[PDB]
Ligand binder design. Structure first.
Ligand code: BEF
Ligand code: MG
Length: 1162
């Protein structure tokens, strides 16, 4: 049995701490250090080693580096921390620390300290905080587990327990609950500069840089090494300062407490929302701005209209109901028949209404009585916050490819050092000079400037991305954007505005036929009449059927959809229960209202009307009855059903747009009905016979940029999928409009008629004429999986979990509808565990688990360019002196590596358009560096053993050329428009290694040939000494010219231009230097300028040698290009993966569109 009983935790272990005396980085180094110290200090018989300054410095550095590595091993890994710092314990009575390991993809390893509480006389509590969860020890089960509440037990509690709950009394029980469950607080840490710098300073690359810099302190230079260390410290300080600033700008979040009424100790008291305990009786009222319900509550009395904007994703108000109507002694199941009564935390209560089981007096603020069940970090949004903060480690550019690259270079470095040391010991030279030379060889091959170059090449991309208002917190995730195989998308807020807008009034032509209405095959009217131009009866119904309440000051409370209808209609209500005055020019006062019941679906009202139409001059007045409802219920009350009633609303509701039916009745044609007769009117008399007005269609309006951005993503080698939380029909229609899916579509769900307790999954069509049944064993491959597309809903994902068909449902599906916040993370993890890199672009809180676990996660805020301009104006004005609404810095930008600020779907291609421009650079800085470094190894391994030396001017020219060409490579800007070809993803591949080895072999062969020819023409039989000054000779000129041509060629051939980044002819800083240096080299080779040869201490040349040298340089330059070209054409992987393989018809349509737009572009 596992020690920790939780699905997330893999394994645990009990530990006992040790003091500083017994640590593994103190104990071996306190008995070894004095032994060497005595020998160095007061032995005077140094026969073990000679005793020179460098010989003792080597022994100092070895022990210091061993101490540093032994200390850092406890910080790099936690298993070594458990092995070194602590020891294995026996049981709970002696353990003080515990080590917890999470599952493979749900966080990071940790060591947590145990806390013991002595609230009981003979009872104690053992708890440790892992990932801000209060794990507790239960002695009966001999295992740790999470806290348990009243609502969660293997016997489900009866309804009488919550119905008869009278709050919390008996103050000692209150103290027990407070000490056992804790306060309702979140307390996000927001780490400061010191811990960030400590975390940054123990990275392997910084330690490697510090060690490589400190190795140069071998008495050669005491002023050229401290300056580099100071520069490194300054750079690492400013990088972490920028990260801290851009992290505190966004991740700084807070939940403001608000006072509430609590029925504590049999009395209603004012209590801050920070201190709430399970079992408390809470009166819930209308919520304030930017503040949701503080805790998970279940209603007991009254009805509330809430806005589930953080679980469903939509903003359409719901109708929560109490549990008074349910009888006692009933099981409280949550999945069905009572999920309409649970009130989750973090949501906003739009309205509260009452339209005494426990004998409790009503609260003074006149809210709804409810019982809080779960509080703290165990609520529904507590898990969301936990997935925000601790879910995934930073990347920090310390991947295994860099380690393999460094080892691959270090192999050649060690080989060269071994060769040099063998020659030195054979020639019996001084050991100190040999150690100096070997240290130079070791630190010159493996590059100590690679992290600096990578950081510069990523920070320039950050500065380029900052122009389009995209701000990023983790800079080293930009290279991940180059290789993207699937792009996930949300539906509400990302591709479509979240608010519901009135499309207009439809079906006004029903009944009488004008013989010009555009119909369909099934005879459904499709005319869309704007709400601005409408008849008298329909606008009076639209202005009278609403349910709006005016307060004392004048604020209007209700569903915002009737506000958006009224302000478009131009009407306005006064302080009294009246509606005042487009083109209607009238007034109406209402008398009696009915209520939405969720069983009858009928909002009806009576009123007295007077309207004066202006276009025709007709006038109406008297009494009026307006009814708004669902079309099926309204249809029965019509006395004359029109000719095409059951087709128009069906066609409109199969498109995903919400539809409502409007009916009017004229009770008395002149004057009101009369006093007190409206009061006795019954629901079955008011809603008896009515007259049709029209269908009011509401929909979420599509953005103007979604189609173009999705088209540009699809026409590339990417693939676009949609993971929404809306209805299947609306998601299917939006996907069809945006061209995510263009074929016949089949959805996977339960039958559309509401069946509860039935597990039958059936394939359905949008037209609803195909009902192929299926069972969770295997989907049929040849027809359903191949001919028609798919749409898997969230009700079929948890029924397909673990089966063999699951691996087939993550490959042939493009949209997912009605998806819970956990299932989005599940889908993205399943896609990531197949080999595809992913990207998610969300807007809200319900997709945090998807934003965090995606490789590149963008969060789109809502704000136009004019708002940013006004914010800039306000900031400039307040800075000059030393007001506009701020951006909705919500919850998606907290958990996303990137954050847009412009509310555009085109911000997703642009990031991709930058990612390629980074990745293509990041590859070649690996290829250009290593090859150069490899050449340097040879140029210091067997060529240094020769008598060749270079003058100061030549060295300065080579260094300036190398520095300029290396600084020009990193700075790169993108090229507009995505391309069908994909860059090379990974550094370790047959193409890169083959090209590097081939070019290095060509360089080595050319150098060997020219050295043997130069020795052949004029032999040098004199002895060779390695400490002499520079001497001009023909070898010293030939080797230098060839080496300079090699340094030119490595930058000349290894450069990828037009399809991803800047062309070479546009990059002035590299091109001018390359052409100038190669012109200088060729001019010196062909002896055009006699003065130029003596300018750089270059000897005169024989006529026969000049031609063969020029030909060998030309052969080198040609072969270095030919080998790379043939390897790129043969053994390279740039094509699309199996998930993005477009069908031929789609490519044909793309070609037709391209040629048509090119033809009309003239
Ligand atoms: F708009 Be979503 F589904 F978060
Ligand atoms: Mg959303």
């Amino acid at each position: 049995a596992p020690l920790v009983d939780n699905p997330q935790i893999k394994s645990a272990e009990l530990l006992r701490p040790l003091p500083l005396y017994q640590h593994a980085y103190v104990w071996p180094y306190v008995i070894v250090w004095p032994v060497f110290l005595r020998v160095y200090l007061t032995q005077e018989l140094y026969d073990k080693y000679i005793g020179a300054q460098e010989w003792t410095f080597v022994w100092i550095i070895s022990i210091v580096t061993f101490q540093t590595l032994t200390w850092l091993c406890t910080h790099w890994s936690v298993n070594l921390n458990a092995l070194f710092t602590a020891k294995k314990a026996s049981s709970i009575e002696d353990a003080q620390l515990i080590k917890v390991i999470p599952v493979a993809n749900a966080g990071a390893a940790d060591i947590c300290k145990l806390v013991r509480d002595k609230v009981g006389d003979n009872k104690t509590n053992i708890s440790f905080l892992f990932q801000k969860r209060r794990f507790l020890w239960y002695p009966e089960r001999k295992a740790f587990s999470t806290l348990e509440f009243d609502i969660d037990a293997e016997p489900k509690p009866t309804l009488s327990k919550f119905q008869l709950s009278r709050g919390i009394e008996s103050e000692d029980e209150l103290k027990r609950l407070e000490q056992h469950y804790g306060t309702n607080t979140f307390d996000i840490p927001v780490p400061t500069f010191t811990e960030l710098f400590k975390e940054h300073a123990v990275a392997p690359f910084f330690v490697f840089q510090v060690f490589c810099v400190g190795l140069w302190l071998l008495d050669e230079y005491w002023y050229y090494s401290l300056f580099t260390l100071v520069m490194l410290v300054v750079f690492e300080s400013t990088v972490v300062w920028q990260r801290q600033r851009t992290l505190t700008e966004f991740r700084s979040m807070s939940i403001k407490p608000y006072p509430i009424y609590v029925y504590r100790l049999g009395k209603w008291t004012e209590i801050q929302s920070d201190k709430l305990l399970p079992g408390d009786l809470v009166s819930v009222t209308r919520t304030k701005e930017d503040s949701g319900v503080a805790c998970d509550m279940i209603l007991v009395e009254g009805t509330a209209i809430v806005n589930e904007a953080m679980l469903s994703g939509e903003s359409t108000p719901l109708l929560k109901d109490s549990i008074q109507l349910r009888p006692g002694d009933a099981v409280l199941e949550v999945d069905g028949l009572d999920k309409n009564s649970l009130l989750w935390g973090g949501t906003k209560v739009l309205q509260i209404t009452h339209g005494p089981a426990s004998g409790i007096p009503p609260p003074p603020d006149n809210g709804a009585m409810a019982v809080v069940t779960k509080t703290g970090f165990e609520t529904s949004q507590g898990s969301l916050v936990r997935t925000m903060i601790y879910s995934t480690e930073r990347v920090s550019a310390n991947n295994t490819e860099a380690l393999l690259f460094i080892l691959f270079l270090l192999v050649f470095a060690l080989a060269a050092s071994w060769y040099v040391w063998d020659e030195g010991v054979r020639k019996d030279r001084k050991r100190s000079k040999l150690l100096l030379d070997c240290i130079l060889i070791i630190t010159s091959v493996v590059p100590p400037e690679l992290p600096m170059e990578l950081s510069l090449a990523v920070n320039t991309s950050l500065s380029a991305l900052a122009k389009f208002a995209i701000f990023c917190t983790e800079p080293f995730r930009i290279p991940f954007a180059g290789r993207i195989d699937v792009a996930c998308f949300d539906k509400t807020g990302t591709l479509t505005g979240e608010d519901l807008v009135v499309e207009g009034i439809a079906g006004l032509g029903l009944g009488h036929s004008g013989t010009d209405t555009p119909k369909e095959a099934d005879g459904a009217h499709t005319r869309m009449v704007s709400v601005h131009d409408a008849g008298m009866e329909t606008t009076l119904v639209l202005a009278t059927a609403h349910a709006l309440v005016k307060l004392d000051e004048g604020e209007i409370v209700g569903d915002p959809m009737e506000k958006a209808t009224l302000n478009a209609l131009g009407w306005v209500l006064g302080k009294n229960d009246t509606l005042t005055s487009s083109g209607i020019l009238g007034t109406v006062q209402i008398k009696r209202r009915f209520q939405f019941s969720s069983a009858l679906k009928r909002q009806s009202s009576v009123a007295t009307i007077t309207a004066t139409e202006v276009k025709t001059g007709r006038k109406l007045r008297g009494s009026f009855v307006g009814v708004k409802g669902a079309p099926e219920t309204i249809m029965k009350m019509l006395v004359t059903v029109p000719e095409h009633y059951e087709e128009t609303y069906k066609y409109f509701t199969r498109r995903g747009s919400r539809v409502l039916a409007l009916a009017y009745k004229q009770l008395t044609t002149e004057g009101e009905l009369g006093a007190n007769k409206i009061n006795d009117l019954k629901r079955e008399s008011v809603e008896a016979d009515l007259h049709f007005a029209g269908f009011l269609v509401l929909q979420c309006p599509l953005k103007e940029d979604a189609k173009q951005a999705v088209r540009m993503l699809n026409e590339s080698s990417h693939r676009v999928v949609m993971i929404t939380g809306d209805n299947p029909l609306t998601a299917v229609h939006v996907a069809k409009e945006v061209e995510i899916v263009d074929r016949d579509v089949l959805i996977l769900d339960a039958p559309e008629h509401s069946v509860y307790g039935e597990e039958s999954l059936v394939w359905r069509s949008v037209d609803d004429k195909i009902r192929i049944d299926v069972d969770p064993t295997k989907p049929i491959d040849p027809e359903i999986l191949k001919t028609k597309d798919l749409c898997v809903t969230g009700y079929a994902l948890n029924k397909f979990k673990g089966q063999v068909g699951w691996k087939s449902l993550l490959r042939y599906t493009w949209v997912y509808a009605r998806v819970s916040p956990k299932q989005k993370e599940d889908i993205l993890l399943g896609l990531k565990d197949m080999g595809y890199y992913t990207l998610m672009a969300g807007d809200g809180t319900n997709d945090v688990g998807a934003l965090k676990q995606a490789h590149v996660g963008v969060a789109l805020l809502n704000g136009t360019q004019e708002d940013l301009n006004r914010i800039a104006e306000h900031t400039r004005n307040q800075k000059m002196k030393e007001e506009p609404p701020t951006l909705k810095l919500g919850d998606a930008s907290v958990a996303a590596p990137f954050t847009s600020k412009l509310r555009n779907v085109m911000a997703i291609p642009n990031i991709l358009r930058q990612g390629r421009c980074t990745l293509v650079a990041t590859i070649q800085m690996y290829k250009i560096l290593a090859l150069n470094c490899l050449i340097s190894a040879y140029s210091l391994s067997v060529l240094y053993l020769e008598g060749i030396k270079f003058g100061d001017g030549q060295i300065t020219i080579s260094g300036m050329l190398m520095s300029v060409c290396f600084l020009s490579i990193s700075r790169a800007r993108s090229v507009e428009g995505l391309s069908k070809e994909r860059p090379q993803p990974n550094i370790f591949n047959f193409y890169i290694i083959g090209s590097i080895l081939g070019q290095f072999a060509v360089h080595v062969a050319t150098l060997i040939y020219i050295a043997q020819l130069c020795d052949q023409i004029e032999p040098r039989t004199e002895v060779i000494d390695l400490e002499a000054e520079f001497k001009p000779s023909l070898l010293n000129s030939a080797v230098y010219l060839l080496q300079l041509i090699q340094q030119i060629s490595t930058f000349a051939v290894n450069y990828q231009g037009r399809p991803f980044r800047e062309s070479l002819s546009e990059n002035k800083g590299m091109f001018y230097g390359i052409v100038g240096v190669t012109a200088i080299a060729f001019a010196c080779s062909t002896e055009m300028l006699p003065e130029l040869n003596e300018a750089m201490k270059l000897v005169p040349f024989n006529e026969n040698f000049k031609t063969i040298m020029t030909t060998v340089m030309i052969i080198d330059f040609v072969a270095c290009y030919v080998i790379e070209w043939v390897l790129k054409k043969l053994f390279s992987d740039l094509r699309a993966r199996d998930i993005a393989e477009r069908r031929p018809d789609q490519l044909e349509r793309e070609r037709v569109r391209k040629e048509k737009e090119a033809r009309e572009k003239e």
